[PDB]
Amino acid sequence: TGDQRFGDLVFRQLAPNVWQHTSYLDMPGAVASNGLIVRDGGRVLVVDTAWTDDQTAQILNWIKQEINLPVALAVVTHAHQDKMGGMDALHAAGIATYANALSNQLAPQEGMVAAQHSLTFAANGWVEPATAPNFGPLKVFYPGPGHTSDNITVGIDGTDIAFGGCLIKDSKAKSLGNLGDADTEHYAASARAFGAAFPKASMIVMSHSAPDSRAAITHTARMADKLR
Ligand SMILES: [Cl-]
Ligand SMILES: [Cl-]
C-alpha cells in the first residue's frame, strides 16, 4: 500500500528525496520497469527513462508539478527499452543525458536513441569524474558485464539506497530473467562487484521488483554461479 499514481506511472517514495518511478509495458503479459528520481538541492536528477516517450513526458510533467525543480540531467543504466526507450522525450525537454559510452555505441543496434553524453570508467569500475560533472549525490559504478555488457549501477550518497538496474534480481526470484544479452561467465563477479562498491547500502532498487535487501545481491550471484 501507499503508492501514488499520475497518469499511468506510479511514484513511490523511498527516502525523503528519492522516488521510485514505475512504468508498464505489455509483453504479449505486462511488465513493470523501475527508475529513480532524485531531489538534490535546487535541481532534479533522473535515473532511467520509462518504456516510452509518452510515459517519460509524464514523468517530466510530474516533476514540474510535484517537485517543481528543473531537471538537470538524466542517467540511463544500459541500452535496453525499459531504461532507454524514452530518450527522445528527455531530449525534447532539453535535458542533458548520460550513459556508458558503450551503451551509446550499442544504442542504434538495440533500437534505442543514444544519450548526448558518454560516461567512461576506471579499471576499478568507478566513473571518471570529468565525464560525470555535477552528478551531486549520484555515484556511478560499472561493475563489469552481467545482464548486458554495458550495464552500470548507481548509489545515492546520503541514503541506504543503491540502484542495481536489471543486474540484480530479488532475493526470492526463481531465475535471472532475460539472459538474452548476458555475459554468463562474468555475471556472478559483476553482481558481487556492485555489492562491494556500495558496501553500506541496505535498500537495493532493481528494475522489476519492489526494493529488496542485500540478500538480493547474494541470491543473484548464487544463481549466476550455476551458469558458469
Ligand atoms: Cl522471478
Ligand atoms: Cl555503500
Curated annotation (Swiss-Prot):
Report whether Hydrolase shows up as a keyword of the record.
Answer: yes
Q: How is its activity regulated?
A: Inhibits by captopril, thiorphan, dimercaprol and tiopronin. This enzyme is not susceptible to inactivation by the beta-lactamase-blocking agents clavulanic acid.
Q: From the UniProt record, list the reaction(s) this protein catalyses.
A: a beta-lactam + H2O = a substituted beta-amino acid
Quick one: which residues bind Zn(2+) 2? D82, C166, H208
Residues recorded as binding Zn(2+) 1, renumbered to this chain, are: H78, H80, H147
**Keyword list, A-Z:** Antibiotic resistance, Hydrolase, Metal-binding, Periplasm, Plasmid, Signal, Zinc
Write out the GO cellular component annotations: periplasmic space
GO terms for biological process?
A: antibiotic catabolic process; response to antibiotic
Q: Which InterPro entries match?
A: Metallo-B-lactamas, NDM-1-like, RibonucZ/Hydroxyglut_hydro
One GO MF annotation is: zinc ion binding
Q: Which cofactor does it need?
A: Zn(2+)
Please indicate if the UniProt record lists Manganese as a keyword: no
Give me the comment on cofactor binding: Binds 2 Zn(2+) ions per subunit.
Per the entry, what this protein does is: Confers resistance to the different beta-lactams antibiotics (penicillin, cephalosporin and carbapenem) via the hydrolysis of the beta-lactam ring. Does not confer resistance to the polymixin colistin or the fluoroquinolone ciprofloxacin.
The record describes its quaternary structure and partners as: Monomer.
Task: Show the NCBIfam families listed in the entry.
Answer: bla_class_B_core (NF012229), bla_subclass_B1 (NF033088), blaNDM (NF000259)
- Similarity annotation: Belongs to the metallo-beta-lactamase superfamily. Class-B beta-lactamase family.
UniProt protein name:
Metallo-beta-lactamase type 2
